[PDB]
């Protein structure tokens, strides 16, 4: 049985895709990116809008087990681990971190991809 | 027990990976990339391998639960997302859309990895 | 039932995130780097690690369904292909490789990540 969580915005409907989606203990959450003028505060914002389709989804972020952080900019990695950290310090899922050349938008500077299980 | 598809590509041969892979309700596809001279013909022809590779595996496109898109010009995303959506409207799966500097090959234009459930 | 393997890295440290985590028969391995003056070798370290980390979670290189390699240069596709043939030709998991404009530092030149069931 298959759940799936959308959150009303244009780009799913562009796209069809959901911004969640369970079936048995597997839920697996879309590219995710982050609202705010820097990465520390774009990081935070995606795992916030991570957690709530989580959530819609019956999970939490204790059930992540991989997340997937692409990055305009590696060199600033740091300020982006910190945010995961304080989010994953003790869960510690499994990562990636790696830079591409560009995102969906020229302003976004993060996006974050997470799969949990139950 | 675990069961494979193989398209008898000589890709597979050098590098040793199959297209998709079965076990227990799961079904994971590889990054496939398509024929066709531009990004829509492209985008089309990978989903239809896609859609072989999950058939051959028992899958079928509505058991697609996660969907990653590599694009070398995502400025183009309307091009792929219109195609992604005749495929997927309904079904909607969770993605990702990212731009990389370049695909195995300069012609190429967009990769599309898929995960399965069931 | 979950477990958790670390390599005691700062950096993983920093970011807070695990080497290999299991939950039922899924195993889900993190980006992986390896040591190594060029890409064949490190290539092939990070494959050791990899292993190493799978086995620190009861799953051997057989289990692993799916990697996903991400280069500094795809145009040396083929040295980084013969590596993991030599590990993957009979299991043959299924992969992607694209390239990425870097990894988490200048000399690493390729990294992989892993999903393994049972």
New interface residues.
Partial sequence: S?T?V?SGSEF?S????????R????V????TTGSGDDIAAQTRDALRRIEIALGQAGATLADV????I?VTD?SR??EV??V??????K??????????????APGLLV?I?A?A??
């Fill in positions: 298959r799936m959308s799913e562009a796209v069809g895709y959901s911004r969640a989606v079936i048995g203990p597997l697996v959450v879309a590219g087990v991989r997340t997937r692409y590696i990695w740091r681990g910190e995961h950290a304080q989010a994953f310090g869960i510690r899922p499994v990562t990636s971190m790696v830079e591409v050349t560009a995102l969906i996006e991809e799969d299980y139950v």
